[PDB]
Automatic annotation (TrEMBL), chain B:
Domain of life: Eukaryota
Portion of the full-length sequence here: 51 to 99 of 100
Name this polypeptide is given: Ymf56
TrEMBL record, chain C:
Domain Carrier, chain residue ranges per copy: 21-96
The organism of origin for this protein: Tetrahymena thermophila (strain SB210)
Protein name per Swiss-Prot or TrEMBL: Acyl carrier protein, putative
From TrEMBL, chain E:
Subcellular location: Mitochondrion inner membrane
Source organism of the structure: Tetrahymena thermophila (strain SB210)
InterPro entries in UniProt: ATP_synth_F0_dsu_mt, ATP_synth_F0_dsu_sf_mt
Keywords: CF(0), Hydrogen ion transport, Ion transport, Membrane, Mitochondrion, Mitochondrion inner membrane, Transport
GO BP: proton motive force-driven ATP synthesis
Protein name: Uncharacterized protein
A GO term, aspect molecular function: proton transmembrane transporter activity
GO cellular component: mitochondrial inner membrane; proton-transporting ATP synthase complex
Pfam annotation, one family: Mt_ATP-synt_D
Family assignment from sequence similarity: Belongs to the ATPase d subunit family.
TrEMBL record, chain G:
Positions that bind ATP: 6
Coiled-coil positions: none
Family: Belongs to the ATPase alpha/beta chains family.
Source species of the chain: Tetrahymena thermophila (strain SB210)
Domain ATP synthase alpha subunit C-terminal: from-to ranges: 1-77
Protein's job: Produces ATP from ADP in the presence of a proton gradient across the membrane.
Listed name of the protein: ATP synthase subunit alpha
Signal peptide as annotated in the record: none
Subcellular location: Membrane
Amino acid sequence: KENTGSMKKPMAKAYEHPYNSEHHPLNFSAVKIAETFHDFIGPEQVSPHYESFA
Amino acid sequence: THFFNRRHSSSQEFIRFRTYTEVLLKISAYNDFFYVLNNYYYNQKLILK
Amino acid sequence: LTQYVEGQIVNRNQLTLKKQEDIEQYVLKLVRGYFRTTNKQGLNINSVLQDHGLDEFDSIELAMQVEEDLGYVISAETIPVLNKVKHFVNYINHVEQFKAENGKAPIA
Amino acid sequence: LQWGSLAERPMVDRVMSTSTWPVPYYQRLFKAYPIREKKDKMSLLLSDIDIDDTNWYQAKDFLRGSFRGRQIVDYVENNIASNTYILIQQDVANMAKAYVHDICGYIDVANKENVRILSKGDLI
Amino acid sequence: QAPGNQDKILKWISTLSNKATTGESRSYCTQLSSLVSFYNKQHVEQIPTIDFNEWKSVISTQGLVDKVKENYESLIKEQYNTDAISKQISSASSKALDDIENELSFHAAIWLNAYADYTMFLFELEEYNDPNDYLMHENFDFFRGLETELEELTETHNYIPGAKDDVNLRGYLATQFAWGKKVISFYRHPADDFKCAKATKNMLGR
Amino acid sequence: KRLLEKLNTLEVENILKRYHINYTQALIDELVDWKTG
Amino acid sequence: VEMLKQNQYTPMKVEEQVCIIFAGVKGFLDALVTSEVLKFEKKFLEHVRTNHSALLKRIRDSGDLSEVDTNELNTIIPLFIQEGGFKLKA
Amino acid sequence: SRIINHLRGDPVYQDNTKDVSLRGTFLRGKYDDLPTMIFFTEACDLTANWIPFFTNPQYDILAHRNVWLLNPRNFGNSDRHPSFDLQEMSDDVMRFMYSQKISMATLGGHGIGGKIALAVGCYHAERVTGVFSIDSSPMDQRYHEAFKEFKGYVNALTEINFKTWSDKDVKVFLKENIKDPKWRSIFTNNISKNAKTQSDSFNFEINYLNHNLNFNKADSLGNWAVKNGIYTGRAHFIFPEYSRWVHLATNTLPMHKVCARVKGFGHDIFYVQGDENPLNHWVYDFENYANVVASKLNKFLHSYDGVHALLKDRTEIGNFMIPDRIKSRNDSKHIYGDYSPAHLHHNWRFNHIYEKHDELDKKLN
Amino acid sequence: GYKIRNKSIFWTRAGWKNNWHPKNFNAPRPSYGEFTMGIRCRNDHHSFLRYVQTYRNMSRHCKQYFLGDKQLEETFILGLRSLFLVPYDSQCLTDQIKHGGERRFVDQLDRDFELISYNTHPYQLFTYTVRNEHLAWKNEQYEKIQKGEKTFEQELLDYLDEQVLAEKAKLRDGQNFSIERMTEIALHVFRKARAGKVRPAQDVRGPDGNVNDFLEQRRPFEHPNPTGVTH
Ligand SMILES: CCCCCCCCCCCCCCCCCC(=O)OC[C@H](COP(=O)([O-])OCC(O)COP(=O)([O-])OC[C@@H](COC(=O)CCCCCCCCCCCCCCCCC)OC(=O)CCCCCCCCCCCCCCCCC)OC(=O)CCCCCCCCCCCCCCCCC
Ligand SMILES: CCCCCCCCCCCCCCCCCC(=O)OC[C@H](COP(=O)([O-])OCC[N+](C)(C)C)OC(=O)CCCCCCCCCCCCCCCCC
């Protein structure tokens, strides 16, 4: 009997806010500023060498 | 402060109550493994014993 | 007068009871429709909503649904006294009597 | 579809590396996170939360996905006198009642058979 | 049959009784135990064999010893029909049993859902290592929902740290040696002002 | 109590201690009997 | 003392006495009230004859109280006292 | 039976330090193919005591790796040789790995065992994936009070003569001369009676050991020489908060001094929260200490052990690219760029997994 | 692992763990009618009804953007109650707060509703994103089922049901297939399936069963390291 089960059709989509995006988030937090900051200073500059440059 | 308290302030002698975000994530953000585990427990114990 | 239902726009219908037997049936159908209600068949006219898993915040959601089905405008001062099925039945009658005598809806 | 060997673990856990001299001096400060994508992973906030309403609401959702589960839901939400869906068993009163009311009902079954066998004929 | 066939049945009743705490539960457990012992009572009396020939020879009324034998044997053939009873008890059990068969199922499904929550957390936690070596926005992505909560505090100008946290442990750690050791009051907003003022017969509102 | 305090001042025994499991004297006897038997 | 008491014209079987006398020395009778010990004797013996019939047979035929009977008997005596309706308060 | 398999042999006194063979217990893992872990117990301490730690379902360490509870030379059942040079004792492990067909292994140790484990990574790093040291540090401990007691007890044990001394004479000697309960129990269980009850003796070479400790010079086990060098690979250190062997104040610096990749406290160095108790050295006895050691061990084995230095965790395998040094490759027509370093199979030398998968890859194409 | 050692961590000048009435110099003092001429105070007895209407608004104004999704309306209610039940279930004695916790919380919920009336509250935008990702995954299952194809979720359930049969057919000495045993079997499959997503199963080897994938790799010519230098 369990194998005979079926699945209902779900909704196509929920509400899409016309003024919120992943790159331009509507509301503010220090989390998004952190993403923009580490994109500016770039990722950790990993050295492949055995001694420091200086 | 928000990051530390929401991850280290809970204790066993008190009840931690679910927040709004924790309700939406459990019910409307569960992954495939979670869906499989529940039905896996249900079929084996509640149906097939 | 239209609302979304599972993503589809559907025309909303309003009810006019004007009869005691129709009110008791509507409230039970209403209370039994709420996903928080326990012992739906054990629910009767003299059932305390507290005994069925309902608190003050659930009575609001029920009153909010009464406004949708009947078109009433229920004030915040009246909601916190609706804690039994008998209360919804008597409040619905008091509103129908008020509009039948005073010709207007009660103060919201 | 292909599943591999149940015993074997992913090759990542088996694949190893070793060090040698000379060594790079640089000590990694942070983990690289170039792309902000953490999909298909559940939140770690859902760690030590006690039983609440979300447990019985999500249970019905999964039970309603099965035929036997749909019967449990309909019967529980209609034919169980409980003031809450957060069911907690701390006593076996309701469990023993249902057993004595059932195992006892099947009494007199043998005495009934004796009536037929003994009423068949008279020894004399 | 006689030996060892009831050992397992004793463990089930023992655990069932140990879980009973209320006196009412203890009473029904005693009733249940009696029914089990009643059904499980062993009958061993060494059913003796009848030698009708011996009685037929020593002394008996003509036609009696033979009539008893033929009639006795007829009833010995009759026996219980275990097959019929085995089927009825397996198909349908009872009404009250169905009530708890469906209650305990939903009960277990509630706590299996919680067992899965705890299990899947420890499963996701394997990918989390060195919280102190993750970037700020990567840690918040593991704990999805903290950014949303942090936005709500900012948009409502609840920029006093730990105001909406019932246990502001971070505030206690920062005030272990503070003058006038205190933590912010619960749900305190930086804009609320409950100051009052009165005029009395005396000066300065005294 | 006084005389006891004054007087105060095996393979199965060691193996069980390794697992830090509290062992009664009765259990030790059965295991020894189980081996010999 | 309350256990050894016996009515008139009421002889007891040897095997039945062993069970009752056993429960007394072991101290199980200390739980229920003394006034309920005499009636407990009757109820206990009747309960044994019906459910525990193989136990009585071994004690009768062999005439010895084996260890298996002790464990079974030692386990039902505290159990029965809790089952029957008695005054458990000593 | 199956999970517990300890090869059986007799110790052999060896004149050549290269003809030394190590013997110990092997704990099989739950899964078919898993990397191997070689763990060295404290000096004069039994390997069996660590079995319940590595065979506990709550910890589930065998789910990660197969464990070799191995005895160093002059200890337990392994061969005997007067020298304790960590370079020689390290070569012993390399021969064991060869005889047992182990390409590379994870190394662990308790106390002095941790030194022996770390020494192997210092002398043979290309074949060691990581080191996990418990209540030890690459440091000179000759003058630590805890070591002196151990050094003192071993000297007292040289006074007993099993031939003349009776069983009771021994028990009285230990209680009075050995105050520490654990050391006392450890030494008692190390006493064994040879076949034919010829006489009783210690499983470890008491003569060779006492000379090493009593002399108290560079070759002593308490000492850590500059000759041992630097360990280039992954290293994690775990020790009690109040430990007589590793003091949090200054005994953590040797880790940075000897281990190049050690980041520091909280990343590769942890202390277990505990009280002052001289028995805290034996973490496997107390559940509180053990539960923390196990969790940290499983984390090291799962995410950090056998991972390239410049990679944070095992998660970065296949998604993090390491910068390349110019003129580092033989190919001249090579465009230098970032690359993900190669992580090989744990026993790729003694199997043909690469030859097999190469064939399967061709079938795809 | 690590416990706070300071016993006086939760001490305040107002008592232990007191975050409802911190000690301050200008403390509340009573008022006497016979001696009071005038007073300026904002406290009133309107917080109860404001607590009721605020709920009705935050609920009704959020449902405007749920598109009749009944499962979302019921989920949102559970989340809305968790926000209103904070004063009733917290360790903080909300009835002893300095100048009235009732007015404090009501005024706080009003600030949340204002953002809700504009559909700019982070809980709303978080619910939309979470729900859309959920429906995209549910619709993917529906499209695969209408084609008679098997879902990745059903393949696991069937693979786990058969593994249980294999493990219990050898478990004859005991007969307690605990929930612990059922779990480790599923997790072992999950870890292999989890690693399979990034490295799919090409051959009988299975998901993530190729050693060659872990040999030295290089960025493709068409996608170099955009953020930093390579050498
Ligand atoms: C027409 C011809 C004219 C042009 C000709 C062309 C010439 C052009 C010149 C270019 C030269 C080549 C450039 C190479 C890179 C830059 C130089 C460098 O050293 O980088 C490597 C150096 C470290 O080398 P590394 O081995 O790769 O790092 C390993 C570890 O990660 C590092 O951290 P660690 O702790 O893990 O390891 C040890 C660490 C330990 O030492 C340190 O870490 C140093 C600690 C400093 C940080 C402390 C906090 C202070 C910084 C706060 C930030 C304030 C500035 C920003 C705020 C305002 C916004 C502008 O490093 C050391 O070993 C010792 C430090 C190096 C020796 C001392 C150098 C001192 C001067 C460098 C800074 C310049 C100061 C301003 C001078 C200019 C005046 C206008 O990087 C830095 O520390 C900072 C670099 C910033 C330099 C900016 C100036 C560039 C001009 C260079 C000219 C030479 C200096 C002239 C000043 C003379 C004053 C005495
Ligand atoms: C450089 C960046 C900018 C920095 C900006 C300023 C940073 C301020 C840092 C925070 C400290 C602020 C000091 C507040 C006093 C805290 C101590 C205290 O409460 O007293 C308790 C004290 C200490 O109690 P205690 O018990 O906590 O400590 C006792 C100390 N021992 C142990 C040594 C005995 O007790 C009292 O009750 C005294 C009450 C009088 C306090 C005097 C307060 C005067 C300041 C208030 C007016 C300021 C408003 C300015 C508004 C300007 C508007 C334009």
